[PDB]
Write a protein that binds this ligand. Structure first.
Ligand SMILES: COc1nc(N2C[C@H]3C(=O)N(C)C(=N)N[C@@]3(c3c(F)cccc3F)C2)nc(C)c1F
Length: 387
């Protein structure tokens, strides 16, 4: 329905992540926490770091409980180490509940905290299977549902500004909404279409067809989900498996061939700039991802614009961007630049993810993002990768 208390509770941007205010401990210690559907731990800075202006101080919390266990998390882009415990946790612009949750108190880290991101921890919203050190460490959302009457569902509306936000603007700007326990109808237009959650670990989905400006990429659909496809608010880009990325970039280059861009742009490294207001959106194609539907032999599609996959960056008065589609060796990742086009419903109760056009997606007068269906699609189970 309507969840006014939770609307506009996020801040941030696709490159540095979107965060929500939370409190930990007694008396409550306020922290900004990145919303991450690509991990399953609640982990917060708990020791001084040059990029943190605040951190969780366990000795100041009367409700802190030490689990006497460490946790070491090395990942591709960095690492963090911490100490496990539990404490009382709340979300001020959330459900009016307080729960006892696991917290990994980060004591050491490398390339984890981002200078100027304004967040001090991460809220892993995925399933226990991928929790660290193992699946016995109950994730925050599982604790929230078990201890309260909050429905087993959350929904995210990530709002890209469509232009760069400076240090002050990004702190003053509304970055979107995280609706805990429901769907807020003011955040989207049109209908919600649902895709099954293939397996409960990451939020895994199955892509069954890909188009660039209506032209079928025509790959065996198993390539689109090799080795998995996931929805991850903690990744900035739309990441595609190597072979799919190579085919998609060739097609995007062909569609936009009236302007030549350097190799560094297509590698997502180099910015491209245009005179203020002259970004040639129309030369860039729309991209449609067809997802398995809930009905047998039915799919639907989500369509994004270059206003989603070209990420605004500061250079001058020029309008500059980076190409926010990049290669992956770990499957498709529908990151924040894709989520910015849609209101995304993580319906854990019904093992499905819903998509609708976002009320805050960036577009122009000629094209809009879309969520459309149904389409007849056969043998969609064959699109899923095994082993
Ligand atoms: C919190 O706890 C854990 N965290 C991670 N993560 C992996 C990271 C990552 O690469 N992506 C793509 C990702 N989705 N999540 C990470 C992340 C961010 F989102 C944003 C900024 C920094 C980050 F480290 C955090 N993984 C495991 C296993 C955790 F226990």
């Amino acid at each position: 329905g309507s969840f006014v208390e939770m609307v506009d509770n996020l801040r941030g941007k696709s490159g540095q992540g979107y965060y929500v205010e939370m409190t930990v401990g007694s008396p409550p210690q306020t922290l900004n926490i990145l919303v991450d559907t690509g991990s399953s731990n609640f982990a917060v800075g708990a020791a001084p770091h040059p990029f943190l202006h605040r951190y969780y101080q366990r000795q100041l919390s009367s409700t802190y409980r030490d689990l006497r266990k460490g946790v070491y998390v090395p990942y591709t882009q960095g690492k963090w180490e911490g100490e496990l415990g539990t404490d009382l946790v709340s979300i001020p612009h959330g459900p009016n509940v307080t729960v006892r949750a696991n917290i990994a108190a980060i004591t050491e880290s490398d390339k984890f905290f981002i200078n100027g991101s304004n967040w001090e921890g991460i809220l892993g919203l995925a399933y226990a299977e991928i929790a660290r050190p193992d699946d016995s460490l109950e994730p925050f959302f599982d604790s929230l549902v078990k201890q309260t009457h909050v429905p087993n569902l959350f929904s995210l509306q990530l709002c890209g500004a469509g232009f760069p936000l400076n240090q002050s603007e990004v702190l003053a700007s509304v970055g979107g909404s995280m609706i805990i326990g429901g769907i807020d109808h003011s955040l989207y237009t049109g209908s919600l279409w649902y895709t099954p959650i293939r397996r409960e670990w990451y939020y895994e989905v199955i892509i069954v067809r890909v188009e660039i400006n209506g032209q079928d990429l025509k790959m065996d659909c198993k390539e689109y989900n090799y080795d998995k496809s996931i929805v991850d608010s903690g990744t900035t880009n739309l990441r595609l498996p190597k072979k799919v990325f190579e085919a998609a970039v060739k097609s995007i280059k062909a569609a936009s061939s009236t302007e030549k861009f350097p190799d560094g742009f297509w590698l997502g490294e180099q910015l491209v700039c245009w005179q203020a207001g002259t970004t040639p959106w129309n030369i860039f194609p729309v991209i449609s991802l067809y997802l398995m539907g809930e009905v047998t032999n039915q799919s639907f599609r989500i369509t994004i614009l270059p206003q989603q996959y070209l990420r605004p960056v500061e250079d001058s008065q020029d309008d500059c961007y980076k190409f926010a589609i990049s290669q992956s060796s770990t499957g498709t990742v529908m990151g924040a630049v894709i989520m910015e086009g849609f209101y995304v419903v993580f319906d854990r109760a019904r093992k499905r993810i819903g998509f609708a056009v976002s009320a805050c997606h960036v577009h122009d007068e000629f094209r809009t993002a879309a969520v459309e269906g149904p389409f007849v699609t056969l043998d969609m189970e064959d699109c899923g990768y095994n082993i």
